[PDB]
Amino acid sequence: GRLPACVVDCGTGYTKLGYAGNTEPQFIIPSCIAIKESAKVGDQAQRRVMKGVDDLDFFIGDEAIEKPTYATKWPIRHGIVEDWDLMERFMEQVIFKYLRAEPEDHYFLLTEPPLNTPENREYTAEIMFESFNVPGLYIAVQAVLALAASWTSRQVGERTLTGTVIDSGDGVTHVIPVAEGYVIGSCIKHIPIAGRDITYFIQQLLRDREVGIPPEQSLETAKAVKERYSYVCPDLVKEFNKYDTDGSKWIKQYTGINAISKKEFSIDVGYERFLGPEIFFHPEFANPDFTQPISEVVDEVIQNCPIDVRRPLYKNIVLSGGSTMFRDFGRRLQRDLKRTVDARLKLSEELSGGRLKPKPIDVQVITHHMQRYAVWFGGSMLASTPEFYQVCHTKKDYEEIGPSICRHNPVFGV
Amino acid sequence: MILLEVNNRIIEETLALKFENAAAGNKPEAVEVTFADFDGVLYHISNPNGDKTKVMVSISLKFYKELQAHGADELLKRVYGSFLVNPESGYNVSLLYDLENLPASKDSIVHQAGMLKRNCFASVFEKYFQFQEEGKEGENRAVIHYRDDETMYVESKKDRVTVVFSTVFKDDDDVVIGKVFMQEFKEGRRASHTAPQVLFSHREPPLELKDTDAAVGDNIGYITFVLFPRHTNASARDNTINLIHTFRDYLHYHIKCSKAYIHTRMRAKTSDFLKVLNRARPDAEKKEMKTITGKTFSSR
Amino acid sequence: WXAXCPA
Amino acid sequence: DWETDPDFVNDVSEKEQRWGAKTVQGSGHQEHINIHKLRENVFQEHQTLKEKELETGPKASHGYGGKFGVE
Amino acid sequence: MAYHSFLVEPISCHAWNKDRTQIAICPNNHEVHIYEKSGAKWTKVHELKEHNGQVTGIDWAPESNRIVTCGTDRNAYVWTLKGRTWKPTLVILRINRAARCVRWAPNENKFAVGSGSRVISICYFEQENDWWVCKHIKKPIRSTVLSLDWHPNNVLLAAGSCDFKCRIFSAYIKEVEERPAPTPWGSKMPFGELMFESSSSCGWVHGVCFSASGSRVAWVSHDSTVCLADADKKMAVATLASETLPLLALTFITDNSLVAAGHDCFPVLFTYDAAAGMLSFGGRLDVPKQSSQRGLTARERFQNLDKKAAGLDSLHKNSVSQISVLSGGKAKCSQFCTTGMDGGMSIWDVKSLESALKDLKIK
Amino acid sequence: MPAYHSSLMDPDTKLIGNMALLPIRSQFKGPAPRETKDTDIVDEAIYYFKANVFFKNYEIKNEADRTLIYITLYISECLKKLQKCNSKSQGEKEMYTLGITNFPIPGEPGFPLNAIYAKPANKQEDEVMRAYLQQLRQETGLRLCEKVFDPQNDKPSKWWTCFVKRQFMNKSLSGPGQ
Amino acid sequence: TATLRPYLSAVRATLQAALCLENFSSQVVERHNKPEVEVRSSKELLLQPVTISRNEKEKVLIEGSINSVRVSIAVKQADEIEKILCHKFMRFMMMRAENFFILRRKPVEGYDISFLITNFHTEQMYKHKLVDFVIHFMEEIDKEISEMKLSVNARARIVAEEFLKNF
Amino acid sequence: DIAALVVDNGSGMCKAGFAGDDAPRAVFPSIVGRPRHQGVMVGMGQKDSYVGDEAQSKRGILTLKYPIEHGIVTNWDDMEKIWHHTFYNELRVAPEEHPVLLTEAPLNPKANREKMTQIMFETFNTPAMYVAIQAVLSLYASGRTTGIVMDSGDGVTHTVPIYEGYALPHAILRLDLAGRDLTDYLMKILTERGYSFTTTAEREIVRDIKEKLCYVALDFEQEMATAASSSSLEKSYELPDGQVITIGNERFRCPEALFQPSFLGMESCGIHETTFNSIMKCDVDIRKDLYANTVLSGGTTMYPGIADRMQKEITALAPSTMKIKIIAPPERKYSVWIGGSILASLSTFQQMWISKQEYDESGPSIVHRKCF
Numbered sequence A: 001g002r003l004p005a006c007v008v009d010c011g012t013g014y015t016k017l018g019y020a021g022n023t024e025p026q027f028i029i030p031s032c033i034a035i036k037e038s039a040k041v042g043d044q045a046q047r048r049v050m051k052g053v054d055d056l057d058f059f060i061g062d063e064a065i066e067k068p069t070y071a072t073k074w075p076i077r078h079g080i081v082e083d084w085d086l087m088e089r090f091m092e093q094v095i096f097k098y099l100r101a102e103p104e105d106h107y108f109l110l111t112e113p114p115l116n117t118p119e120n121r122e123y124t125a126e127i128m129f130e131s132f133n134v135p136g137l138y139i140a141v142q143a144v145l146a147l148a149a150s151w152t153s154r155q156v157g158e159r160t161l162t163g164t165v166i167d168s169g170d171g172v173t174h175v176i177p178v179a180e181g182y183v184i185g186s187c188i189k190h191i192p193i194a195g196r197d198i199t200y201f202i203q204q205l206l207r208d209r210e211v212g213i214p215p216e217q218s219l220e221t222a223k224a225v226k227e228r229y230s231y232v233c234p235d236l237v238k239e240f241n242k243y244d245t246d247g248s249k250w251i252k253q254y255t256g257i258n259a260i261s262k263k264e265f266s267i268d269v270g271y272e273r274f275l276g277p278e279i280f281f282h283p284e285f286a287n288p289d290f291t292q293p294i295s296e297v298v299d300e301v302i303q304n305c306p307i308d309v310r311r312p313l314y315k316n317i318v319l320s321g322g323s324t325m326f327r328d329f330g331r332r333l334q335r336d337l338k339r340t341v342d343a344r345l346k347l348s349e350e351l352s353g354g355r356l357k358p359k360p361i362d363v364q365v366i367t368h369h370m371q372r373y374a375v376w377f378g379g380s381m382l383a384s385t386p387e388f389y390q391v392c393h394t395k396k397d398y399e400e401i402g403p404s405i406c407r408h409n410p411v412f413g414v
Numbered sequence B: 001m002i003l004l005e006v007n008n009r010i011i012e013e014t015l016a017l018k019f020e021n022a023a024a025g026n027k028p029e030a031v032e033v034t035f036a037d038f039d040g041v042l043y044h045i046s047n048p049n050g051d052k053t054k055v056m057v058s059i060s061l062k063f064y065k066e067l068q069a070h071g072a073d074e075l076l077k078r079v080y081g082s083f084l085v086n087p088e089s090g091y092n093v094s095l096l097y098d099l100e101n102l103p104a105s106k107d108s109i110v111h112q113a114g115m116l117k118r119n120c121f122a123s124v125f126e127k128y129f130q131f132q133e134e135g136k137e138g139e140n141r142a143v144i145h146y147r148d149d150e151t152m153y154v155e156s157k158k159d160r161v162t163v164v165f166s167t168v169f170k171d172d173d174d175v176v177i178g179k180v181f182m183q184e185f186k187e188g189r190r191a192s193h194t195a196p197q198v199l200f201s202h203r204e205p206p207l208e209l210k211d212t213d214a215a216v217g218d219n220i221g222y223i224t225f226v227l228f229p230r231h232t233n234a235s236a237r238d239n240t241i242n243l244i245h246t247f248r249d250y251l252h253y254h255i256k257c258s259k260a261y262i263h264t265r266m267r268a269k270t271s272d273f274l275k276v277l278n279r280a281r282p283d284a285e286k287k288e289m290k291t292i293t294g295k296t297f298s299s300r
Numbered sequence C: 001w002x003a004x005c006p007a
Numbered sequence D: 001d002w003e004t005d006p007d008f009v010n011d012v013s014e015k016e017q018r019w020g021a022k023t024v025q026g027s028g029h030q031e032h033i034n035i036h037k038l039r040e041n042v043f044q045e046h047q048t049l050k051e052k053e054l055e056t057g058p059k060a061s062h063g064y065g066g067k068f069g070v071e
Numbered sequence E: 001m002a003y004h005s006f007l008v009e010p011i012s013c014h015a016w017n018k019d020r021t022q023i024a025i026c027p028n029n030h031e032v033h034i035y036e037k038s039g040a041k042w043t044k045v046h047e048l049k050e051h052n053g054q055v056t057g058i059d060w061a062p063e064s065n066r067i068v069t070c071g072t073d074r075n076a077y078v079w080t081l082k083g084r085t086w087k088p089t090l091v092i093l094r095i096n097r098a099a100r101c102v103r104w105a106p107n108e109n110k111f112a113v114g115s116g117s118r119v120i121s122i123c124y125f126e127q128e129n130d131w132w133v134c135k136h137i138k139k140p141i142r143s144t145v146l147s148l149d150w151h152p153n154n155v156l157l158a159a160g161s162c163d164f165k166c167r168i169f170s171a172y173i174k175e176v177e178e179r180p181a182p183t184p185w186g187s188k189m190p191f192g193e194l195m196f197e198s199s200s201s202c203g204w205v206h207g208v209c210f211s212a213s214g215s216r217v218a219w220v221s222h223d224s225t226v227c228l229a230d231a232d233k234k235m236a237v238a239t240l241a242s243e244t245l246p247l248l249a250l251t252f253i254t255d256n257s258l259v260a261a262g263h264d265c266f267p268v269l270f271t272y273d274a275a276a277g278m279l280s281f282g283g284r285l286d287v288p289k290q291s292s293q294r295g296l297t298a299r300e301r302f303q304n305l306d307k308k309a310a311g312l313d314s315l316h317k318n319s320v321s322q323i324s325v326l327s328g329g330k331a332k333c334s335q336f337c338t339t340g341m342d343g344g345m346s347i348w349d350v351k352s353l354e355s356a357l358k359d360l361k362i363k
Numbered sequence F: 001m002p003a004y005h006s007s008l009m010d011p012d013t014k015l016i017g018n019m020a021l022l023p024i025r026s027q028f029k030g031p032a033p034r035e036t037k038d039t040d041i042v043d044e045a046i047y048y049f050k051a052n053v054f055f056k057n058y059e060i061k062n063e064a065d066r067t068l069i070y071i072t073l074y075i076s077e078c079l080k081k082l083q084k085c086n087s088k089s090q091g092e093k094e095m096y097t098l099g100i101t102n103f104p105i106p107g108e109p110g111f112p113l114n115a116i117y118a119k120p121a122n123k124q125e126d127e128v129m130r131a132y133l134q135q136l137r138q139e140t141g142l143r144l145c146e147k148v149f150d151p152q153n154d155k156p157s158k159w160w161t162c163f164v165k166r167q168f169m170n171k172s173l174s175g176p177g178q
Numbered sequence G: 001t002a003t004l005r006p007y008l009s010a011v012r013a014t015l016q017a018a019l020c021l022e023n024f025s026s027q028v029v030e031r032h033n034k035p036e037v038e039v040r041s042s043k044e045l046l047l048q049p050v051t052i053s054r055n056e057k058e059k060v061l062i063e064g065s066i067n068s069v070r071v072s073i074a075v076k077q078a079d080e081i082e083k084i085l086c087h088k089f090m091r092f093m094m095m096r097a098e099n100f101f102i103l104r105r106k107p108v109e110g111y112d113i114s115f116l117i118t119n120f121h122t123e124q125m126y127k128h129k130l131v132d133f134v135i136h137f138m139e140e141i142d143k144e145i146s147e148m149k150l151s152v153n154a155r156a157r158i159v160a161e162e163f164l165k166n167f
Numbered sequence H: 001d002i003a004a005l006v007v008d009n010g011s012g013m014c015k016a017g018f019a020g021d022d023a024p025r026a027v028f029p030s031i032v033g034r035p036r037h038q039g040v041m042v043g044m045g046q047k048d049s050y051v052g053d054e055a056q057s058k059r060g061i062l063t064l065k066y067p068i069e070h071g072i073v074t075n076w077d078d079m080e081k082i083w084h085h086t087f088y089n090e091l092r093v094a095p096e097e098h099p100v101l102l103t104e105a106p107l108n109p110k111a112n113r114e115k116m117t118q119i120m121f122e123t124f125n126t127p128a129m130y131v132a133i134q135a136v137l138s139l140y141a142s143g144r145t146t147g148i149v150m151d152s153g154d155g156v157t158h159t160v161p162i163y164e165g166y167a168l169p170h171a172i173l174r175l176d177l178a179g180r181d182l183t184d185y186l187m188k189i190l191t192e193r194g195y196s197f198t199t200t201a202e203r204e205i206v207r208d209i210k211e212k213l214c215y216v217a218l219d220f221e222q223e224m225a226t227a228a229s230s231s232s233l234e235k236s237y238e239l240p241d242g243q244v245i246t247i248g249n250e251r252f253r254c255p256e257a258l259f260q261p262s263f264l265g266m267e268s269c270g271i272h273e274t275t276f277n278s279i280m281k282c283d284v285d286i287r288k289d290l291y292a293n294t295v296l297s298g299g300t301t302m303y304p305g306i307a308d309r310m311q312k313e314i315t316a317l318a319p320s321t322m323k324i325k326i327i328a329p330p331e332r333k334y335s336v337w338i339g340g341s342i343l344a345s346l347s348t349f350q351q352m353w354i355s356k357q358e359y360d361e362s363g364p365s366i367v368h369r370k371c372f
């Protein structure tokens, strides 16, 4: 008989492991690896050669953050794997320790961001096909699986196959318009500004103002401040004024534990309540290359799709990923989008001569019960169908053509 | 991780979560989690007939028939008590935890629930340990089909227990590296003054497999462990069972880590060859000093 | 220094 | 525009966060459901929605009499 | 005698003016750089930038002081010196592939551009319209035209090709000059005629050159062979097969002796014996120089111990690609200039070279 | 989304160089007229400062934007000196003696924005611009010394001295980082 | 080594009989400048492909042209382990084919590795040093693969000792 | 390639430059001045802290404080002031765009390099840094991979033996005895003649007297008996106010303290015996290669005739068959910096940085993992 396919959604800040056919990932670990690192001289490809069996003395996931004598490395940066040695070791413990899957009896469904270079896919195919020897692989785009995770929380008869998926993870934020089940790939947008940029901005804010934060935790604090006291503001300068004139109400206190002497430190959370998420509607706060808000990027995405599929795309904007769990994020997004759309419609009516008043475009932003792991569940659907075993790259295909079998994805033509 | 572990993580995690939700007094939610393990084992944790108060953990194995033989459930019964119930349709063993009658110290039953496969294996294996302890020669010797193309022939004598693994790997690269990993397996007895006699053979099957249906062929390797009464006593048989159980999976695991090991040496040698090529690029006369980003220096 | 010598 | 709340805090453990946050009043560990039934139900409901979206849209087959009618 | 390295990138082609005080080179890009001899050092005086692709042929007419440049943009330009700047006049070549070589005629009334379109373009002037026009010689050619050299009677034209053949066409233009006088090559000379076609079928022809008197045509092949066809002997071919790497350029320093160079980076000398009809390896012209070694500093020792864990005994460190005659003409030469793919420019001397080696006799 | 520009340009506003000589509600001497409405350019600049320091693109639209740019650049200099003080009665003296200190004006070395600021055309315009900038500096320091210092402990509040490292488009009236 | 000395001398002498490259613009397309041995567009700019072999299964195929040389190497592979290691090693060499300027991201069918030296590599980089690099690769590849094999054997022994120690 | 600032910043004098040159771009004494009198002339502009050469020129009205003492940073505010003056005034370069290669003496407290990393990452926001050991850079500058470096700076002296690149970390001998102790000793012994320098502004005068007149005697007792029996060694130096002083016997008594610290009331052995002990702690098969590769550095080894003294002293302690070479180049004072520029200009060194990202996630405890 057949065994369920393994689903491994490898994200920059968190990896979701499971067996296809379930409702939620069996494991959600941090995407980090603790290896023994010491003071050495020479290149990186030369000091990584470990004598004996010392290359198996490493940990991953939750067990890699606890280890205080190991060095913690993150192999994935901005969704693109920058280190393949650490990624191979991470994958081998993901398969042989957590999933406990024999990699020769299970099809694998990995994930990727839209702008993953083809050489990354070729290296992933080389790893899964020659090292782990999987009978089949399928590298699906991350946000396109997040659409089929909003159907579990919406009433019957309004579970559509058309919508704009906004996936904001730890390292990348991408916008994918799906229409009737077909990924409109030539309209996908991809911005490397995401949760971790918010965490760097927040720690730089805290470090310029607060005192008493242990250095070795200056990041771990900026996550607990970001994922707890952060919201979205309707206006920036008005919020600065609201904090200045009535600071006794808007300024909160965060009390953490210094995990060396177990003492407690206390800091004041002020402007970084609303300046964190604001790098979504002002990306220049974290990366001066991008200057375009997320509402305008979504509007460009939808306005580039075919005409008669623009009106349903506005109706089912599905959020996904952790970085979209900010209070009143969807509300401000929908407000800006409604402003843009109504202004465009009124301009078109005025240019027409003033005879017809067209239907106001319904704009809706869908928050659902599965956002934190909306991608994985989507995979758990796709990798549970029969047709799945018809779209995978069989081992024969790799043995015949080579890793170049995995070189194409729906973002580029030919 | 060098040695594979015997306890499954998903079972322990799910059952501990359910027991924390039940002990705090929250209302129980549904659960339906199906997954797999090594050697083609299939687990299913669900509820019996939508009854959200009972959790049934079922397991389907490959040694289907050897566990149904009389006396192959002594260990399972002894360890699981009243949790052992009739198998769920399609599966082979099944435990049933009532979330309202859970005894105190919920850590022990979860630690023994994560080792369901190890316990099903040790139950069909301690039969011969006992056949040898009780001082009886010629006791029953069988072939556990612990996989689908590989076998484990167990035999119990008056003074020893012989375990013959008939093993074969699926992939060609894995076969070629496994020939080495199995040839070099007798060089391990130099690491300990007390290790079971290990014999390797791939020219011809041993004389134990001439009356039995253990898998034989010209692509199969035979690894014979001779466990003596210092490895099968009532105090060191747990470790022996764990090792004999996870031997094949451990060999497969390390065969698949050997490649990720070799890749580092290959990268090192690639860089060493690039350094020999670099002697061909004529050194520039003057370089423009840049910044960490790569922009012009903007100053002297 | 802290103990021994000044620095 | 819309007013904000100063005293809102969704304290959650990192392990609680990995599943969901108190900013979405339903997120977290959900009740396990059958996935194939959901898939087929979504397929059928999308088919039914497409049928009515076609019926309520402009119809080229409107002037041939019968159920279509005469222009 | 000297060696000057203008740049580290190859030099495609170079050209000197009448009094050999200025040189026009190609820096391996679209521009043409005109340097001037100022005492002992060189100083760039002009930059000519009109081409779209890198120039592959420059030629400087001595008497009229007009430069002609052909490049890989399928175009040709004639630069004239207005006051202080060189202004270009575009020539319509009508080719559909990259040009390869250009050569002024001896009388500076027309110029030949060999291109990779399997044609030769004889360009001349139309003062009735101020129109640089061109005619085409394209019949027996089947590949790129690599090298050109004109007969001293302003009509015949030697052309080497990548079709393994050296040919002698007749570039007579009946609207800029009179009917030419009969030469030992043939009495019938209409435009596009074929007076001579070598019998070789191996190796491309990198360089052709007419004699000083226009009675002998010599050429070099990638087959390592140097050949000479004599017209006073029923167009007889004398070949010499060398045992070194091939040659790329050659010239006539006398009516009897040739100076070639190529992928060896040093000039060699050949001689022709008319009383027997056979070439003789006169020998290497350059004396093998001993390149001084330098002690390494600590910054350079570690820089090339981390990064990488002269071999050649001539002036040029890369193959020599073009040889020109500086002073003395082709009847009795005294200085020849070589430019190669190392950006260097070696001004040689025949007297000093003959003095340094006494085993070296110039026929 | 664009930064916060000033909305005080009027078609009858006079120009000095190419900066809007906007009226200011102050007591110091200067060539700028007196304001009757409750908001001058300095109040607007102090209102928009905390937000304008985070943006990294600022399109100059009119001359009032150039005046607001100057004042936003000078608040960053006031903050550097107010960070060291420990009493509002000392902050006021520091702000006075800083406003007196002559900073570079358009068209001189040290001014960060000579490219996008039209220098004076003669000597009279030079003098008027000097006096105008001095008045702006004095009044900005005076108004800011009441914002930075909170009355609970009478020392610079950490909510204003955290913007010492934040530079408006990485420009400053002082030296390059000194 | 000393058993490859005549084979390597012949290969080196054939390498610097080719590698006498020149600049050349294409004939079958307007302004492209492409290596003439890769496109095989014109049959007049292609020299004879010469093979130099030490035995039946170790060889070098050299394909010359007017502005490019393609050198394909078929390396010694004695058994299956050496075949696997040679494949993986050549693959890890191809991965960095922009640091090796003369390398080729895919070997010619039938051969283990392939170098493609155009004329820019002989104008901007030392020619004799490129010849030396090719000959050094051919000298040392067998030794490095044998050391890989010994490393695999040592790994197998260490794994066996790590298992049989717990009993 | 990338341009990386190399900031030696040892005790005594800070020498900063760019990686790839042959000499530090800016060398200035690492001092911080503070006015000690009232300001009465308002309107001329005043500052409350002078740094470097400006503090040296105005030393008449300042209290010069060294932020580093005996190789350890003891006042971090003045250290930040020194670094700010180095970045924005001497080099005039933005520090948030270039890597920084700082140096530290061996066997210093870990809190020193920890706070150094924290300052360089949280104050100046350098994108990457690296903390190297001074003697290793000194060996780089000498262009050899074997030898014992004997670096005698202004606040600390230390020897490091290295063989084929493998530095022996169990034979590194440190000794808190350097130019500042010698300057204080000269201040002490200058009283017996009749001159009294007692304020921190005159210590600079004493340091100039030392580094212009003092030298090392080849045979101490012979030179003492000579200068005590004839006025042929006395030299006259002019103070910055016209006074002239004459020093005789003192000239070689100041540096002699380096070879016998019993003058300063210390128990430790001289620098020659320290180097010999460091050598003798290494294995027997490499000592012969160390003896012929002794390297000096630091500005305290610039005394006339110290190479000959060191050779004559080591030769008396080493077997009569070992050849003792004292490789003292005439650019010894800048050697520690010159080796730095060599190091930061290497290709593989880009893989040894401490990237700002790597620190943002691990705090100051990363320097002990990325830098030995």
Ligand SMILES: Nc1ncnc2c1ncn2[C@@H]1O[C@H](COP(=O)(O)OP(=O)(O)O)[C@@H](O)[C@H]1O
Pocket (backbone or CB within 6 Å): A011, A012, A013, A014, A015, A168, A169, A170, A171, A172, A195, A196, A199, A223, A226, A227, A228, A321, A322, A323, A324, A325, A326, A372, D017, D020, D021
């Ligand atoms: N409730 C929350 N509010 C704000 N940010 C969050 C929340 N939960 C997670 N994040 C941020 O999102 C990132 C993790 O989300 P995830 O979707 O797992 O990204 P990835 O899948 O790329 O790792 C982290 O950077 C985390 O700080």
Ligand SMILES: Nc1ncnc2c1ncn2[C@@H]1O[C@H](COP(=O)(O)OP(=O)(O)O)[C@@H](O)[C@H]1O
Pocket (backbone or CB within 6 Å): H010, H011, H012, H013, H014, H152, H153, H154, H155, H178, H179, H180, H207, H208, H210, H211, H212, H298, H299, H300, H301, H302, H303, H304, H333
């Ligand atoms: N040429 C010299 N001759 C004699 N003494 C010198 C010479 N140069 C420097 N010194 C003395 O050596 C002392 C310390 O050397 P220095 O190079 O300042 O140490 P560091 O390298 O740590 O700054 C200085 O105080 C100086 O007076």
Ligand SMILES: [Mg+2]
Pocket (backbone or CB within 6 Å): A011, A012, A142, A168, A169, A170, A321, A375
């Ligand atoms: Mg993600």
Ligand SMILES: [Mg+2]
Pocket (backbone or CB within 6 Å): H010, H134, H151, H152, H153, H154, H297, H298, H299, H336
């Ligand atoms: Mg020093």
